[PDB]
Design a protein around this nucleic acid. Structure first.
Ligand SMILES: [Mg+2]
Ligand SMILES: [Mg+2]
Ligand SMILES: [Mg+2]
Ligand SMILES: [Mg+2]
Ligand SMILES: [Mg+2]
Ligand SMILES: [Mg+2]
Ligand SMILES: [Mg+2]
Ligand SMILES: [Mg+2]
Ligand SMILES: [Mg+2]
Ligand SMILES: [Mg+2]
Ligand SMILES: [Mg+2]
Ligand SMILES: [Mg+2]
Ligand SMILES: [Mg+2]
Lengths: 95, 52, 287, 110, 127
RNA sequence: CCGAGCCUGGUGAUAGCUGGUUGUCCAAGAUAGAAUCUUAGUUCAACUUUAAAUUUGCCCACAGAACCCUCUAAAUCCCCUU
RNA sequence: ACCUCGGAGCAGAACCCAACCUCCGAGCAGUACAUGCUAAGACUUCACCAGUCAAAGCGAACACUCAAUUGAUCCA
């Protein structure tokens, strides 16, 4: 990535990550399963259900995605009707 | 020797499913579940999507 | 203090005497000596050690994780999304109790911001304040409040105590102006008229249930009564209250401030208001 | 910041209670913040180390440490592990006891 | 003082009076309301069904028959909501339950049925 | 010093390759792999280091972990107590 | 000739592990047409990506056989 811009001298976001991932404020990243739109005719209903899921990422994956995005993408957003609003905060988490 | 075809329901319109069919056979008419009308209804083949 | 008594005996504090607080200043490490610098933390010779290690996200040739995942519109129109800062009834009560906001006067965005109860960022696409149901119980305050969004339960809580809640729209420009009036006054430009809600937001602000500012006032009584029936409280009669005039008072649409008409110039230095006289200007500002 | 207005009944609906006049006769005094709240704060470090701090402390802070230990002993069974910062007048406690300590300092008259 | 073309008097000509906006069937006084901190709060609503004049006589009779389980020793109908953090919404659910109860009065089991039928068969003898 | 002259500039070209990388003292510290135009390299895991939180970790005893092929051992996993 | 997947020599007995080699096979097909929807807990080809099993529930009826029988992102 661009650590320092030529114009502003600022860290840049990788726009690929924004197109593919959602960041929850708590630090988790959400993604679609790969190949969920692909060749559904030859796939079992159980497998199709597994594919049609929003899944969280590894610690290592999360750390990668954090570095590849600026602080703007990590801010608390109060969207008017956000389907992922409840998932922004963690409850009853011990260590 | 098999082709993937689209099956469209007569009722609960706008719902369809894909099934494989022998190429040399006639057009399929099936009785399949429709979630829009929440019942089993008749489906007809409209066109062949691909050949597998 | 005992420490000041200690100071009395000690030599005078000078620029010679000073030191940083322990733990504040970590030692700087530099590649000199047996330990810190021979390969200098860089390990054995390779791509990493030469300093030419490939970009973040590159997996050495394998299709990268971030690329492998399909695109989905999680952030499709994040910028064009409207955002509303939540103000709990709990927080509102706290502000009233601590005297940060004045319930005797109408409570607005300016009043909330001046009380520093809420922080509104006009940029970052905040469209104002959302009143939320949190702290509905143990809210005992009679207020005339104007918010951009209000939940059913929050409206019920306000009305139970004999208060009045209204729902208003502020466009980005007027929202900036209303939240920070003093900087705007220093800009020199006359007060603009607040633009009407976008087409999609019009039905919300014209609904009596939401307590919209553009809604029919004749529709308000039965709306209030139905809300009272639902949550099982006797609906207070506002007319009987001596603060009826205060509870009634609302800024009409196309008016940012309570006593200031659009088109007026505030001259703060000499403490005066300048009003246009030209027919064209008056027609423009009134419309 | 405006002075909080006088209420006929305390505590307020929000739960706010003014400091006792005259101040309690104790070796230590805990001063309110600018916003007239008890200065007890939760703290987290390493994402697992949970702490509570009492901040604006004047006088004998060691007296406060002993009293805090005595208060928290029945709740924990064990004596709470604490740090005393004489310089800054701060007392730090391992674990979250923000609500308990706030209530305690309120009843003590701070 | 200032009035625009989008002022409410102009928008709605029939509504002009200030009081018009602020002008004013279960009796809440009759009902007894209690709150318990059971996390979701708990609200309990109790009222004497027999002496409840606001409900119609045949409706009382039908409610007593249908909802006999909720009836106390003293004859008080008790209904409870523990579905919400806010006691407001809990009270609302209780009141709605009362409304639905009145309405329904106005206008798993297979196992039990077989057991009862079998009991009847065994009873088939004379003195 | 011509399989494409020389000079200057771009240019501090690029080099997963070669060579080098400068005070003192102490401490912890070694060999499962996967993918890769990939095996002179890199990314993830494994191991290693630090700090923090909390409870178990290791050693283990009875019991327990398949037939088929007609054979098959040293062993291993699991595991209270200690 | 080979590069991907499945089986045997091949870890004699949890798992994993025999490069190179010597052999075999796979790149389908058949029957359903609820091969609907949803959801505890798990397994996992030593990472990731992928892949696998499944209680309960809703709706039906009175989550197929086969060792592999397969292909991410973009884009159209
Ligand atoms: Mg060394
Ligand atoms: Mg040397
Ligand atoms: Mg190296
Ligand atoms: Mg080397
Ligand atoms: Mg170089
Ligand atoms: Mg050593
Ligand atoms: Mg390749
Ligand atoms: Mg190579
Ligand atoms: Mg190399
Ligand atoms: Mg053991
Ligand atoms: Mg694994
Ligand atoms: Mg292998
Ligand atoms: Mg089932």
């Amino acid at each position: 990535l661009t650590y320092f811009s030529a114009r502003k001298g600022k860290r840049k976001t990788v726009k690929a990550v924004i197109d593919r991932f959602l960041r929850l404020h708590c630090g988790l990243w959400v993604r679609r399963k790969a190949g969920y739109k692909k060749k559904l005719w030859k796939k079992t209903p159980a497998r199709k259900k597994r594919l049609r899921e929003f899944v969280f990422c590894n610690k290592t994956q999360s750390k990668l995605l954090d570095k590849m995005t600026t602080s703007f993408w990590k801010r608390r957003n109060w969207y008017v009707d956000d389907p992922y609003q409840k998932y922004h905060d963690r409850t009853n988490l011990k260590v | 020797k098999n082709i993937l075809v689209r099956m469209v329901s007569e009722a609960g319109t706008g719902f369809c499913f894909n099934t494989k069919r022998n190429r040399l056979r006639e057009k399929l008419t099936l009785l399949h579940y429709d979630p829009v009308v929440k019942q089993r209804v008749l489906f007809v083949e409209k066109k062949k999507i691909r050949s597998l | 203090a005992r420490a000041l008594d200690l100071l009395r005996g000690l030599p005078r504090v000078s620029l010679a005497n000073l030191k940083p607080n322990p733990g504040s200043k970590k030692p700087e490490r530099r590649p000199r000596g047996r330990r810190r610098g021979r390969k200098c933390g860089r390990g054995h010779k390779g791509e990493r050690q030469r300093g030419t290690r490939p970009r973040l996200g590159f997996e050495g040739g394998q299709t990268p994780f971030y690329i492998r995942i399909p695109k989905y519109g999680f952030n499709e129109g994040h910028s064009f999304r409207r955002q509303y800062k939540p103000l709990s009834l709990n927080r509102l009560q706290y502000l009233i109790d601590l005297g940060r906001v004045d319930p005797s006067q109408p409570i607005d965005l300016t009043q909330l911001v001046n009380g520093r109860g809420v922080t509104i960022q006009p940029l970052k696409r905040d469209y104002g304040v959302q009143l939320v149901e949190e702290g509905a119980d143990t809210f005992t305050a009679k207020v005339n409040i104007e918010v951009q969004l209000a939940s059913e339960l929050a409206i019920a809580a306000i009305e139970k105590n004999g208060g009045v809640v209204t729902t208003a729209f502020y466009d980005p420009r007027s929202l900036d102006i209303v939240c920070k009036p003093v900087p705007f006054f220093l800009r020199g430009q006359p007060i603009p008229k607040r633009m009407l809600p976008p087409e999609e937001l019009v039905p919300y602000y014209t609904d009596a249930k939401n307590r919209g500012y553009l809604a029919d006032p004749a529709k308000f009584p039965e709306a209030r009564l139905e809300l009272a029936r639902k949550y099982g409280y006797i609906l207070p009669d506002i007319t009987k209250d001596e603060l009826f005039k205060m509870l009634c008072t609302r800024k009409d649409p196309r008016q940012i401030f309570f006593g200031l008409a659009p088109g007026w110039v505030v001259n703060m230095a000499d403490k005066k208001i300048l009003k246009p006289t030209d027919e064209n200007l008056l027609k423009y500002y009134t419309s | 910041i405006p002075d909080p207005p006088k209420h006929e009944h305390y505590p307020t609906p929000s739960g706010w209670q003014p400091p006792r006049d005259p101040p309690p006769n104790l070796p230590y005094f805990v001063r309110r913040s600018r916003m007239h709240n008890i200065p007890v704060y939760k703290d987290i470090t390493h994402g697992n180390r949970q702490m509570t701090v009492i901040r604006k402390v004047e006088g004998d802070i060691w007296a406060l440490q002993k009293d805090v230990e005595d208060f928290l002993s029945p709740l924990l069974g064990k004596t709470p592990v604490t740090q005393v910062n004489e310089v800054t007048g701060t007392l730090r406690i391992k674990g979250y006891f923000d609500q308990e300590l706030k209530a305690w300092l309120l009843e003590k008259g701070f | 003082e200032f009035k625009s073309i989008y002022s409410l008097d102009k928008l709605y000509p029939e509504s002009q009076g200030s009081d018009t906006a602020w002008r004013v069937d279960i009796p809440l006084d009759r009902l007894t309301i209690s709150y318990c901190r059971s996390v979701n709060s708990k609200a309990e609503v109790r009222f004497h069904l027999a002496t409840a004049e606001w409900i119609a006589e045949p409706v009382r009779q039908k409610i007593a028959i249908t909802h006999k389980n909720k009836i106390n020793r003293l004859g008080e109908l008790i209904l409870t909501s523990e579905s919400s953090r806010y006691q407001f919404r809990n009270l609302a659910d209780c009141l709605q339950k009362i409304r639905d109860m009145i309405t329904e009065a106005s206008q798993k089991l297979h196992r039990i049925r077989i057991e009862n039928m079998n009991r009847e068969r065994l009873r088939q003898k004379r003195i």
